[PDB]
């Protein structure tokens with residue numbers, strides 16, 4: 100293995116390090132995804148495509164991979180600068196574009212795995228998954244539950260997130276999180292912290308974006324890197340409606 | 350709360366955000382601690398002292414908070430640059446020196462909590478904890494278990510790591526990790542992945558440094574930030590001999 104991956108030994112053999120080096124990852128969303136990209140790059144995944152159309156905002160600094168100097172810059176330009184300072188020989192391809200129903204299929208082509216970190220206020224979070232399923236591309240959905248990291252993998256031949264959507268209202272991250280907490284309580288392991296923050300968020304007078312913490316960003320980035328390593332080396336993983344939830348109490 | 354910590358709301362109230370802002374943290378060791386430092390800084394902990402005498406090497410980039418440009422610079426110089434580019438008004442005090450029996454007490458004095466990330470090949474890992482107990486400074490011990498993050502907190506009036514050290518034989522991180530695996534198995538939760546890497550590492554022909562992965566580093570950084578927040582806000586915590594273990598498998 101290379102001197103950069105020296106301490107990866109025993110956990111990974113030389114042939115696995117080689118395999119994940121060129122494994123093409125598609126990253127939709129450079130918010131929580133900017134933390135995921137660094138952890139995955141340092142692990143050894145050197146072929147990452149990042150698509151995001153937002154700019155770096157002040158409020159990102161509590162949980163995303165940007166600096167004071169990055170504010171007002173395209174997230175994709177900023178995270179590529181960061182990633183290429185970690186690994187100059189890395190293959191980091193960025194696109195400062197929003198995903199739409201018209202362009203999303205062309206971006207997906209050519210990748211072996213995808214990470215759906217798209218805001219539900221755009222238009223294509225679920226269509227993205229539908230297209231990936233058609234192409235044998237498993238999809239990681241990472242969520243920042245503040246204290247917890249949540250990941251579920253949409254597998255090509257399995258259920259989609261549609262199963263938790265009601266046909267009359269739009270579907271966002273609050274539906275996934277309400278699904279997860281309800282699942283946990285039903286099966287005898289309630290996450291009262293998660294139920295508490297769901298309750299607090301719903302009863303807010305003003306309508307704001309969900310809160311997120313650096314802890315959940317860092318934990319979910321670790322989970323994704325492990326899941327990516329498992330998919331690339333064809334080790335077993337749980338697919339939706341199953342999920343991975345990781346927190347200080349677990 | 351500044352607009353930088355805007356998305357921290359509900360999880361933290363404004364009075365909690367202010368408290369951790371000036372909460373003096375001592376971080377001994379800027380390796381795994383460099384990942385911990387960023388996650389805690391973005392969370393709102395703005396008063397961090399970092400002590401480490403090593404320089405940045407190539408093998409650090411697979412799991413530590415450094416870049417190719419940082420290589421050959423004092424780890425403490427690199428991590429202060431990284432952190433201060435995230436938050437210019439942060440109070441980041443560094444010391445480019447190894448801790449010894451003579452200097453370790455004066456570094457500890459003045460902090461409310463400490464993170465002992467000191468290599469067990471130095472002379473002061475256990476003495477570091479003893480002084481903190483004498484001063485009512487709880488000590489977090491974070492460990493990188495590859496796929497897992499492990500944190501144990503030494504509380505001032507509780508058991509120290511001495512309890513698992515053997516009178517007469519040398520004590521290193523493998524003793525801590527072997528206690529955790531044995532403890533988990535004792536309780537019917539064997540971590541066979543963890544037991545596997547211990548076996549592989551012990552039966553290594555050559556004597557090398559333990560492997561570590563970016564996955565555990567990112568996970569343990571999140572755990573430490575949650576634990577730090579709980580200690581500052583006087584929320585209950587688990588003390589050694591109990592510990593926190595977090596992995597995808599759990």
Ligand SMILES: CCCCCCCC(=O)N[C@@H](CCCCN)C(=O)O
Pocket residue numbers: 128130131132215216217218224240241242243244272273276296297300309310311
């Ligand atoms: C009230 C507590 C619930 C918190 C909601 C989760 C918010 C979140 O994790 N949002 C990601 C987008 C990923 C979505 C993938 N379908 C981001 O803002 O990057």
Ligand SMILES: CCCCCCCC(=O)N[C@@H](CCCCN)C(=O)O
Pocket residue numbers: 378380381382465466467468469474490491492493494522523526546547550559560561
């Ligand atoms: C064979 C598997 C066992 C792995 C050993 C754990 C190594 C580790 O986590 N070492 C930290 C130092 C923190 C120590 C705190 N008392 C570092 O190298 O930063």
